[PDB]
DNA sequence: GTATCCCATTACCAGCTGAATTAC
DNA sequence: GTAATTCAG
RNA sequence: AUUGAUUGCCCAGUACGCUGGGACAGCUGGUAAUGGGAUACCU
């Protein structure tokens, strides 16, 4: 069938058509398959984003489901076998094959005979088992090839995979809109009483938030509606306006220009504990009755879940026609959702042709010149060069590349400057990490007994003074001689060590012996040597309390997410600005190929001074890996063209002169040694050189 | 400067994420 | 009327 | 029927009644790495 497909290069075929093409080819013949492929409609995309839904109620715990018990059993049996044994035991797709499988194997199904369901289990388990062999083979083949070039110039799985607890739905258990009339055995919690929703009616029930009365859930407070005109719905009284205190920085409602998501129930906004939500029960009941419920029935077990997750996601991607119904909403997604028992969610995937995105891979460095040649052949293309750095989190420059042979110049191109808001967000993220650590430690300290508490609190406040006293004692020196407020640990400083070297100080006391060579004790090393230590029992208690609090803390996940949305927001803003500056919307993103696995994660930062040696180091990890992944994943998640070029000798070569030297870079300032022209090291030189490398076919020469 | 625990995160790479028709 | 067959790069 | 698109998740404000934004390719598994904090070595 592949040869027949190869004669349609311009037309893209969906997976359904290819699977349907095989049936036609085996049924009628090549004339039929060509005729069918001629009549196939062109697909607008092939990416299938997932949507997550909240599970409402379940008949049994997911561990007790027949599908879960058989799935875990089959997975364990497969992962306990060898390659030769698995090939002979893996069954076919027929019903008789499954029964034969359970007969030859001592393993027994738990009254689960669904052919489609067991077909998914066997197919997925073998794929996971074969994944380890593929993973090892590619690693070995790459390692052997890499070592060969440098030199010239099994049984039971060693690392068996874990059990995949996800339940994969099939056509037999396809999601249907829940009606209590047709599901008598299905129960529901108390808030889900009197549930009623006709599947075929439109879900387009839209209402204005400004009409809610002042004593009802969702009401927009008066002080947030002071800019609404008199003739509009949300206008506030003139007498009541005099009670508005200014400067409170409370939000202002967007009564006319608001676009995007509409929030209906706000019980989840009040996730604090100082004051519980006033309408918690009322909003819970109302949201329960306004839920859109779908049901998956596997055997005698059922899952009821919200498909409001589908609805919001569909309106986000602008994929719904007028008057969409629950049945149509479920038709927008494939009828094979995945159930996650641990997270308590049911995941839906879009159908292939719904989302107009063609996922693409990263263009390699040697294909940079070829890729732009095709892009410039079919109209123009906008170059987007992004440089990742520490002082500048990302520097972006947009180039309108009408012809591949055109010259790229700072006057020709435009620079996309990093916003101050994103710098503030990065600083706030780091501060939130530091405050989370401080709060966790403080709560753990407060969890201890009074004697341990007072001991720990006493140690922290006078930790620096006692250490300084120990230094001035063991090292006889004037405390005023050493500048304690300029002492540092990141840079090797020996202010105390050098002073002790005078007056015939002992070499052994000031120097530390190491296997490689003798190393002089740094000032931070001196402070840590004489730093007072807690008692063993108190230290153990504090460590146990800290670990217990951290294990159950839910803030680390929130911070990791917050970083993810921060990086993605920066990337989205950069893409939007690239579209805005150069009117053409065919953006190609040029990245520098970075090994973000290591050597790009920043260290912690410590404030200058001796007193800061005894406090926890502040978080200062760089955002380079986050921005690299967020930019690189644009190709797979959104279909954009992303190119990774060789980063060597970028920002070190003069944009005007070919001279290359390491001395050209002085940090955030670029000055060439041959010519006096000066530019910004990252914003101007780096982006321009990256764009030139992308347009050209070879990495730049150095030194 | 090195070494061992503890907590958190990640990077890389290996999977996975139907349905029309027929059978009965 | 739910469940088994049958396609794929 | 709405200016706006009903659940969920993240951030900042709040009079705690909400507003203004943000992400929307996700999951499972294994390995490795990094960051932070203690402790051990040494005069
Ligand atoms: Ni750079
Ligand atoms: Zn020059």
Author numbering: 8 to 160, 180 to 729
Question: Can you list sentences taken from the study reporting this PDB entry?
Answer:
We reconstituted a functional Cas12j3−crRNA complex and determined the structure of the enzyme after severing a target dsDNA by cryo-EM. The predominant class yielded a map at a resolution of 2.7 Å, which was used to build the model of the Cas12j3/R-loop structure. The R-loop displays a T shape with the crRNA/DNA hybrid and the crRNA handle forming the horizontal and vertical bars, and the protein domains wrapping around the nucleic acids. The N-terminal region comprises the T-strand and NT-strand PAM interacting domains (TPID, NPID) and the RNA-handle binding domain (RBD), while the C-terminal consists of the catalytic RuvC and stop (STP) domains. The target DNA cleavage yields a triple strand R-loop with the T-strand hybridized to the crRNA, while the dissociated PAM NT-strand is directed towards the catalytic pocket. Our structure shows that PAM recognition in Cas12j3 is achieved by combining interactions in both strands by the TPID and NPID domains. An antiparallel β-sheet formed by β11 and β12 splits the Watson-Crick base coupling after the dG+17:C + 17 pair; thus, limiting the hybrid length to 17 nucleotides in agreement with cleavage experiments testing the efficiency of the spacer length. The RuvC insertion runs alongside the crRNA strand of the hybrid, making multiple contacts with its phosphate backbone from U + 9 to G + 13. Interestingly, two nucleotides, modelled as purines, were observed in the active site in complex with Ni2+ as a by-product of the phosphodiester hydrolysis. A second metal atom, modelled as Zn, is coordinated by 4 conserved cysteines, similarly to Cas12g and the dimeric Cas12f33.
Recently, a new Class 2 family of CRISPR nucleases named Cas12j, also known as CasΦ, was found in the biggiephage clade of phages. In addition, the RuvC catalytic site of Cas12j1 and 2 also processes the precursor crRNA (pre-crRNA). This family of endonucleases recognise protospacers with a minimal T-rich PAM, and their small size (700–800 residues) together with the lack of a transactivation crRNA (trac-crRNA) to build the functional RNP, make Cas12j an atypical family of miniaturized RNA-guided nucleases. Cas12j proteins share low sequence identity with other CRISPR nucleases and display sequence homology only in their RuvC domain with Class2 type V members. They generate a staggered DNA double-strand break (DSB) and unleash unspecific ssDNA cleavage after activation with an ssDNA complementary to the crRNA, as other members of Class 2 type V7,8.
